[PDB]
Write a protein that binds this ligand. Structure first.
Ligand SMILES: [K+]
Ligand SMILES: [K+]
Ligand SMILES: [K+]
Ligand SMILES: [K+]
Ligand SMILES: [K+]
Ligand SMILES: [K+]
Ligand SMILES: [K+]
Ligand SMILES: [K+]
Ligand SMILES: [K+]
Ligand SMILES: [K+]
Ligand SMILES: [K+]
Ligand SMILES: [K+]
Ligand SMILES: [K+]
Ligand SMILES: [K+]
Ligand SMILES: [K+]
Ligand SMILES: [K+]
Ligand SMILES: [K+]
Ligand SMILES: [K+]
Ligand SMILES: [K+]
Ligand SMILES: [K+]
Ligand SMILES: [K+]
Ligand SMILES: [K+]
Ligand SMILES: [K+]
Ligand SMILES: [K+]
Ligand SMILES: [Mg+2]
Ligand SMILES: [Mg+2]
Ligand SMILES: [Mg+2]
Ligand SMILES: [Mg+2]
Ligand SMILES: [Mg+2]
Ligand SMILES: [Mg+2]
Ligand SMILES: [Mg+2]
Ligand SMILES: [Mg+2]
Ligand SMILES: [Mg+2]
Ligand SMILES: [Mg+2]
Ligand SMILES: [Mg+2]
Ligand SMILES: [Mg+2]
Ligand SMILES: [Mg+2]
Ligand SMILES: [Mg+2]
Ligand SMILES: [Mg+2]
Ligand SMILES: [Mg+2]
Ligand SMILES: [Mg+2]
Ligand SMILES: [Mg+2]
Ligand SMILES: [Mg+2]
Ligand SMILES: [Mg+2]
Ligand SMILES: [Mg+2]
Ligand SMILES: [Mg+2]
Ligand SMILES: [Mg+2]
Ligand SMILES: [Mg+2]
Ligand SMILES: [Mg+2]
Ligand SMILES: [Mg+2]
Ligand SMILES: [Mg+2]
Ligand SMILES: [Mg+2]
Ligand SMILES: [Mg+2]
Ligand SMILES: [Mg+2]
Ligand SMILES: [Mg+2]
Ligand SMILES: [Mg+2]
Ligand SMILES: [Mg+2]
Ligand SMILES: [Mg+2]
Ligand SMILES: [Mg+2]
Ligand SMILES: [Mg+2]
Ligand SMILES: [Mg+2]
Ligand SMILES: [Mg+2]
Ligand SMILES: [Mg+2]
Ligand SMILES: [Mg+2]
Ligand SMILES: [Mg+2]
Ligand SMILES: [Mg+2]
Ligand SMILES: [Mg+2]
Ligand SMILES: [Mg+2]
Ligand SMILES: [Mg+2]
Ligand SMILES: [Mg+2]
Ligand SMILES: [Mg+2]
Ligand SMILES: [Mg+2]
Ligand SMILES: [Mg+2]
Ligand SMILES: [Mg+2]
Ligand SMILES: [Mg+2]
Ligand SMILES: [Mg+2]
Ligand SMILES: [Mg+2]
Ligand SMILES: [Mg+2]
Ligand SMILES: [Mg+2]
Ligand SMILES: [Mg+2]
Ligand SMILES: [Mg+2]
Ligand SMILES: [Mg+2]
Ligand SMILES: [Mg+2]
Ligand SMILES: [Mg+2]
Ligand SMILES: [Mg+2]
Ligand SMILES: [Mg+2]
Ligand SMILES: [Mg+2]
Ligand SMILES: [Mg+2]
Ligand SMILES: [Mg+2]
Ligand SMILES: [Mg+2]
Ligand SMILES: [Mg+2]
Ligand SMILES: [Mg+2]
Ligand SMILES: [Mg+2]
Ligand SMILES: [Mg+2]
Ligand SMILES: [Mg+2]
Ligand SMILES: [Mg+2]
Ligand SMILES: [Mg+2]
Ligand SMILES: [Mg+2]
Ligand SMILES: [Mg+2]
Ligand SMILES: [Mg+2]
Ligand SMILES: [Mg+2]
Ligand SMILES: [Mg+2]
Ligand SMILES: [Mg+2]
Ligand SMILES: [Mg+2]
Ligand SMILES: [Zn+2]
Lengths: 46, 103, 163, 99, 186
RNA sequence: CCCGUCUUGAAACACGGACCAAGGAGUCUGACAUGUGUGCGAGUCAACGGGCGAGUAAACCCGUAAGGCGUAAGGAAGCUGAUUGGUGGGAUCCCCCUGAGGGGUGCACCGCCGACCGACCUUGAUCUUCUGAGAAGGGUUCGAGUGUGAGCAUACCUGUCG
RNA sequence: GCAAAUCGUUCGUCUGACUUGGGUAUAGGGGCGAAAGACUAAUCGAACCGUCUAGUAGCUGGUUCCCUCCGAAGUUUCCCUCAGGAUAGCUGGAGCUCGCGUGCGAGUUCUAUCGGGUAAAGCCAAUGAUUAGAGGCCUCGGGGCCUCGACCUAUUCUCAAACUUUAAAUAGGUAGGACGGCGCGGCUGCUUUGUUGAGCCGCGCCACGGAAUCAAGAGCUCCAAGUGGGCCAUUUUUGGUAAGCAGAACUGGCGAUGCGGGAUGAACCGGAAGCCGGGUUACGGUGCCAAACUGCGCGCUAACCUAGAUCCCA
RNA sequence: AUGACUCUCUUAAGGUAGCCAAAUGCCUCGUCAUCUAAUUAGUGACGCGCAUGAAUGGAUUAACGAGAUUCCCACUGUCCC
RNA sequence: AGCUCAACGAGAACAGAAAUCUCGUGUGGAACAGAAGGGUAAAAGCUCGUUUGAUUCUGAUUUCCAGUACGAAUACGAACCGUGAAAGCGUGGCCUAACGAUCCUUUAGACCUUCGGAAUUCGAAGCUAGAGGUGUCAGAAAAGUUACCACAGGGAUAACUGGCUUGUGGCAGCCAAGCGUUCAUAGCGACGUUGCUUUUUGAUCCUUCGAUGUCGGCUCUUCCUAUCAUUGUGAAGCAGAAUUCACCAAGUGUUGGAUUGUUCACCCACCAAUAGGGAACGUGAGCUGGGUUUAGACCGUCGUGAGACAGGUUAGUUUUACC
RNA sequence: GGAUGCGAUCAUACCAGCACUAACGCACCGGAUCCCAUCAGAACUCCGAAGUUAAGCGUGCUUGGGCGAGAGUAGUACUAGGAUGGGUGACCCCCUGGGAAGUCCUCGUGUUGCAUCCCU
């Protein structure tokens, strides 16, 4: 019916793969009120 | 069906193998048509091998109305303006088209 | 779904601690959360809104967003051969500020000054920590020696308090 | 399930774009037209020989339907539709509890 | 027994030579095998590796993009392991020294008209054996149709991958799964 | 211990096989796709046909507003249609210095964030033929888009499908 | 076999609904049937012949040269899905981007910190189950002032996968710098009573690499095969009297793998392998079979039951 | 002991005349009689009959049967052998 | 917003175990629609006041998970509202379940788009959001029978033997309450408890479905012992006779018949005795074919019917050795 | 040294009984015209200042209950890894490591921020 036998072995053949971490992360899903103001702040930055 | 591929739509469910048209006679057709033209040229000598004179007509629809091409034959109004009776025109190598209008 | 509800198997994990029910102390609502801070997720059973899935209970994550009543938390989740960066929002009642990095900031300053004090005197050093190494030799003053010997067996003593 | 006769809800009409009084009535599916393209195609498919050419559902399972409230704004005289959960007994303007 | 993976051998594959049979390319490879070995120049090593690469790994460089990257660098020699194409969108062509595997007929004419020079990699070795005063450029590798179909599948969330469809229109993959009015949008 | 075979497991009291010769099974074709080789390149393709030509089914030549694919997308449609890059890493090269050094250069690629075109929404000084034009100003929306093209032809392996 | 229905003996009927020749009529979803689905040219619960037709098959069988390299899966989800398919995982090929110890990587530990409710424990703690007496014997019932039981107080025996205050071992998460820190300025339509915050930006300065060990290196993409019946063992563990039974958990093993040992054996012990010479071992052995002591020591056993004689293991 | 009789629920009608452990009865090798030294067989009876019954024909029946069954006499290599 | 519940204690005409009223104690022992768990006390419970956030517009995230959809849930943004003095709370139900694609139909919304020669008005077709349902719930439109049967396969899977197991069946031991006139143990062994056996039946599904001939009897050999008789002995509640218990012991023997296809059983009779079993439930190219288990046929019950019946009945081809 | 207002930590702070308190406070307390409030001026609300520290609040005490800490229970129970270890089995010793919990015993009974005021 079911079994986890051999599944950890399969996962470790090429894993465990950690996601690539970049200096800047996506802003999707953050507070739109904060994001909108930040966009204006960069627009008038000098 | 497997993997990421375009959805197949081959129209090969009938008895298509009985309706295959090969082109192995393509060189022969070129030879036969050239011989027919050569034979025709001697028959109508000294009349030009290009055949009857054809009019200039516009291409149809918005996609081709900027170009001109050969039409079927000169209209009756065109022949009358040129002073050529319609019954005499075809006998001197002028194509006649009694259907074409002049807008 | 598919045989298990959202809060299945949470009888013990999501229950309040013994004699620690009722009103939530207000120091929970006076905490300040900034982007980049580390927080430990600990589900409070009394607050039913903005509560994380049972998996994220007992996990430490990094704050990536701040809202009026909740903080966005990034939590690692192992799925087969990959680690996924799960971004979840949780009401601040379920999060505690983690002390996993409490030593880092104070350690950097000490390293910076030690290197500065060594740079002026032209003595190259290393500020790295080291694990417990072997102890040096030393002398121990003699004292009365208590002799330890095996004890004769007694069946009557093979029971807590004896038979 | 008992629903009040009137209800003060948001109106999407550009005239109002605000909360206004609405009259509550129950939606009822209209009569199927013979001129609808789907009906025109089905009648063509059914003509001649071949018998029934489309499936006919038989294994009914639901014992209820999702009742839809028809809310007519009293300002702009426009209608909005608001479905409610499944229920076996439904009425509009029934006597309230206790009263 | 030894506790290693594949007996400690590498499982990576890289091109150690060109796949082409072009006799002129093989002569260039021989020339730059010698230059890389006897000079230790990083420029020569990079040039040698790129001569092995397949066609898609040697994308063309438009003349207009060549001009923009060469602005303010007239003295330097532009080097491209690939083909230089002409761009009708560029109007003013300054004099420039360009070394490339191939120049299109229009690109060569425009460069030569402007007083520039079109060089081959054997001529570059005589002028810059170590790559001195060179501007090494690469064309856009991922600007092609095939790449648009790569990445996450078209049907997964947050995907802009182009699907494989035999035609374009309302009747070709615009229904269920592509809008909320038909099941879901994906 | 008898080979072949299905099988968790075959020397099997599992099946095929008395012996030898010869014959005997992933092919051809259409569509598409990735990869690679080759030609040309914002183009590419002599493909129907024509002109011919080894007295010739080949080869050679011909695209004049032909056609296919590409060169512009979004929208159901009416329609409208790309103001032309900022930044963190980074190959190579140049200078100083001879440090896990500091400046200049910053291609490819990746991450991040604007702008532009379109669907949807929103916005409207000033004009107009009253329904259009558009000064300014937008959006947690949506797109197989734009921000100095990369394609087309052809050969073959592999894969999906008829 | 004389014979794809015959032979021997024995039997039914024998002037009749009798037997038989020839002619003639009925033809395939049709005929004909005193009816057996009988018969219709050795073919009948739908004849025979040709064609459609190389009919379709998730099922059975087979599938043709050599070395070399890499090398699986019996698991996930969906499916009138359960002998199948797709999907993800595992695998190959093609590379590409970089890197050479300054690596930012790790089926490991160390340091700091966080979560837990199993094992055990607990009832002299809640809930439930449960044994016995003791005192008080106020007040209730029971019977005969007495008296048993209810009651109250302090004790007491024994318990729980769906009880618990408490509470391990093992395992789980996070962090240990150059994507760090500080200083001075700037941007905002967000935020504040407030250039107050928040985030970002510019400039300047500092940053011996900021635990150990290792690092036959790291990242990224494309195309695609096979597989989706598993089985065994230590330990945890459910159903079952039990099973070489059925079903799960972690790891290893077999399957795909020979080789030495266990007499013999897919899984036990040892150990994994190019073709050879020398040396030494692992497990297991050194009376013969059979390479190596009837080696050097102590004790126990005497089996007139086939004394006894090596993990799994009989 | 049995139930003519009475009470009560109830059907379109409640199996009547007959017949039966039947080629139809589960229980069952039913009970009694008979046949035998001995009978799960046979026959004759008995019947609250799992599940008998009237042209889905019931109950009989002389004559007939390469039809199923039991017994007796004759007969015998079926058997003792 | 105010209030505090279950229960108990002490009090009050009728009034009591239990009506209502008063005080006191009261960590929730109550209540919160439903299953269970968790959660909650100036509340999430109870009583009142005002109300419709059970609203409109997208997107993001979680659970499921392929990191697809659906359902459900959560955190924001932009509107419009409710409630409160206000902070604040409210996007249904305290939390964990309560539900549904394509096509088609129908409704709502947008002084919207199209009907392709140009217009107008009907009609029709589109765009956006809901509704009518698929419960086999990622969603065909679906009744039987075959004993007249067919094909592809399956030992992935039943009906024998064998194997594991031994609950059940069978056989044996230990303790000693009691029985035995007296007397635990001549002979017995309650309450318990330890085993053996594979001549019972089950459990399992490992071998066999390109087939291991499937009941019983007949015939014939060999083997076992847990000994019925026979040889030699010990014990007795063994006077004799007969009988019982136990030991060595498998050398020899263990029969003729009625009824039944039987295995089993039962009776008659003889006998020293008429013990129990194995050998692929020994034995079909050894027989036999009564039974079971093809096709004909009858009855009863069941079914509308075709037909069904570990119900009864009768007729029904038993092939080959020379390796 | 304290009180009061707002608090933080939420029993070392709770519960029970007994005892005690200068000053300013905090209370009890007086009244019901107005706002408000009920069956009920009890509560809530408003206005007030005659009386009292009786209660509340505060502090102390108890071989008090509870709670908190230690010791002990105990290297015990359990547990990770190992063995061609023992044993018919059930189970168990040893090796490399980790390591609890009632009873009993001792001790403790809050700490503290801002503001105002009293002791002054
Ligand atoms: K032809
Ligand atoms: K369950
Ligand atoms: K039809
Ligand atoms: K096979
Ligand atoms: K097989
Ligand atoms: K064989
Ligand atoms: K593909
Ligand atoms: K073209
Ligand atoms: K041409
Ligand atoms: K649209
Ligand atoms: K005769
Ligand atoms: K037929
Ligand atoms: K199948
Ligand atoms: K305990
Ligand atoms: K208890
Ligand atoms: K697959
Ligand atoms: K007869
Ligand atoms: K309230
Ligand atoms: K009370
Ligand atoms: K289904
Ligand atoms: K047994
Ligand atoms: K078989
Ligand atoms: K035989
Ligand atoms: K017969
Ligand atoms: Mg066909
Ligand atoms: Mg023409
Ligand atoms: Mg599902
Ligand atoms: Mg699951
Ligand atoms: Mg018609
Ligand atoms: Mg009709
Ligand atoms: Mg080696
Ligand atoms: Mg290998
Ligand atoms: Mg629809
Ligand atoms: Mg989605
Ligand atoms: Mg098998
Ligand atoms: Mg084999
Ligand atoms: Mg065998
Ligand atoms: Mg086979
Ligand atoms: Mg054979
Ligand atoms: Mg051959
Ligand atoms: Mg190509
Ligand atoms: Mg053209
Ligand atoms: Mg438009
Ligand atoms: Mg725009
Ligand atoms: Mg003869
Ligand atoms: Mg006919
Ligand atoms: Mg006849
Ligand atoms: Mg028949
Ligand atoms: Mg035929
Ligand atoms: Mg389906
Ligand atoms: Mg198979
Ligand atoms: Mg796959
Ligand atoms: Mg812990
Ligand atoms: Mg648990
Ligand atoms: Mg528990
Ligand atoms: Mg326990
Ligand atoms: Mg399979
Ligand atoms: Mg499976
Ligand atoms: Mg099995
Ligand atoms: Mg296999
Ligand atoms: Mg052995
Ligand atoms: Mg050797
Ligand atoms: Mg010796
Ligand atoms: Mg009668
Ligand atoms: Mg009868
Ligand atoms: Mg009889
Ligand atoms: Mg007889
Ligand atoms: Mg009779
Ligand atoms: Mg009847
Ligand atoms: Mg009848
Ligand atoms: Mg009769
Ligand atoms: Mg008669
Ligand atoms: Mg007759
Ligand atoms: Mg509940
Ligand atoms: Mg909600
Ligand atoms: Mg208000
Ligand atoms: Mg809800
Ligand atoms: Mg809710
Ligand atoms: Mg629907
Ligand atoms: Mg429609
Ligand atoms: Mg028209
Ligand atoms: Mg389904
Ligand atoms: Mg049928
Ligand atoms: Mg099997
Ligand atoms: Mg007994
Ligand atoms: Mg066979
Ligand atoms: Mg055979
Ligand atoms: Mg045989
Ligand atoms: Mg014996
Ligand atoms: Mg006597
Ligand atoms: Mg004998
Ligand atoms: Mg007989
Ligand atoms: Mg047997
Ligand atoms: Mg047999
Ligand atoms: Mg035989
Ligand atoms: Mg036979
Ligand atoms: Mg037989
Ligand atoms: Mg028979
Ligand atoms: Mg029959
Ligand atoms: Mg009937
Ligand atoms: Mg018969
Ligand atoms: Mg008063
Ligand atoms: Mg006082
Ligand atoms: Mg005390
Ligand atoms: Zn309105």
């Amino acid at each position: 019916n079911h079994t986890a036998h051999n599944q950890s072995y399969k996962a470790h053949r090429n894993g465990i793969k950690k996601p690539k971490s970049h200096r800047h992360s996506s802003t999707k899903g953050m507070d739109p009120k904060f994001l909108r103001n930040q966009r204006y702040a960069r627009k008038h930055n000098k | 069906m497997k993997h990421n591929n375009v959805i197949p739509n081959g129209h090969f469910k009938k008895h298509w193998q009985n309706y295959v048209r090969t082109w192995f006679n393509q060189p022969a057709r070129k030879t036969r048509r050239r011989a027919a033209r050569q034979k025709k040229a001697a028959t109508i000598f000294p009349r030009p091998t290009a055949g009857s004179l054809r009019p200039i007509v516009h291409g149809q629809t918005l996609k081709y109305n900027m170009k001109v091409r050969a039409g079927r034959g000169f209209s009756l109004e065109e022949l009358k303006a040129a002073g050529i009776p319609k019954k005499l025109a075809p006998t001197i190598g002028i194509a006649v088209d009694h259907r074409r209008r002049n807008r | 779904p598919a045989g298990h509800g959202l809060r299945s198997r949470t009888r013990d994990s999501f229950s309040r601690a013994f004699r620690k029910k009722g009103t939530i102390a207000l120091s929970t609502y006076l905490r300040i959360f900034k982007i980049g801070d580390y927080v430990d997720i600990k589900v409070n059973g009394a607050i039913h809104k903005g509560m994380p899935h049972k998996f994220y209970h007992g996990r430490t994550g990094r704050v990536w967003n701040v809202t009026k009543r909740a903080v966005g938390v990034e939590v690692n989740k192992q799925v087969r051969n990959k680690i996924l960066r799960k971004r979840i929002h949780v009401r601040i009642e379920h999060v505690q500020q983690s002390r996993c990095t409490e030593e880092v900031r104070e350690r950097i300053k000490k390293n910076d000054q030690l290197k500065a004090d060594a740079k002026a005197r032209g003595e190259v050093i290393s500020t790295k920590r080291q694990p417990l190494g072997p102890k040096p030799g030393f002398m121990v003053e003699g004292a009365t020696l208590e002799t330890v010997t095996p004890i004769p067996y007694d069946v009557v003593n093979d029971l807590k308090g004896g038979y | 399930v008992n629903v009040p006769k009137t209800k003060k809800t948001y109106c999407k009409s550009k005239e109002c774009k605000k909360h206004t009084l609405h009259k509550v009535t129950q939606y009822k599916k209209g009569k199927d037209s013979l001129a609808a393209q789907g009906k025109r195609r089905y009648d063509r498919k059914q003509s001649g020989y071949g018998g029934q050419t489309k499936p006919v559902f038989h294994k009914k399972a639901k014992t209820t339907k999702k009742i839809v409230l028809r809310l007519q704004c009293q300002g702009c005289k426009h209608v909005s539709q608001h479905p409610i959960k499944r229920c076996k007994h439904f009425e509009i303007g029934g006597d309230k509890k206790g009263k | 027994g030894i506790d290693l993976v594949a007996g400690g051998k590498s499982k990576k594959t890289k091109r150690t030579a060109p796949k082409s049979d072009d006799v002129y390319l093989k002569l260039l490879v021989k020339l730059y095998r010698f230059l890389a070995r006897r000079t230790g120049s990083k420029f020569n090593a990079v040039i040698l590796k790129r001569l092995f690469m397949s066609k898609i790994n040697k994308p063309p460089l438009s003349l207009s993009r060549l001009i923009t990257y060469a602005t303010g660098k007239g003295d330097n020699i532009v080097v491209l392991v690939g083909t230089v194409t002409d761009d009708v969108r560029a109007y003013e062509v300054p004099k420039i020294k360009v070394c490339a595997l191939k120049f299109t007929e229009t690109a060569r004419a425009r460069i030569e008209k402007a007083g520039g020079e079109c060089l081959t990699f054997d001529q570059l070795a005589l002028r810059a054996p170590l790559g001195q005063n060179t501007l090494l450029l690469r064309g856009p590798k991922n600007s092609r149709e095939a790449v648009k179909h790569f990445g996450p599948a078209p049907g997964v969330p947050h995907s802009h991958t182009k699907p494989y469809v035999r035609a374009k229109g309302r009747k070709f993959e615009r229904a269920r799964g592509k809008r909320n009015s038909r099941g879901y949008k994906a």
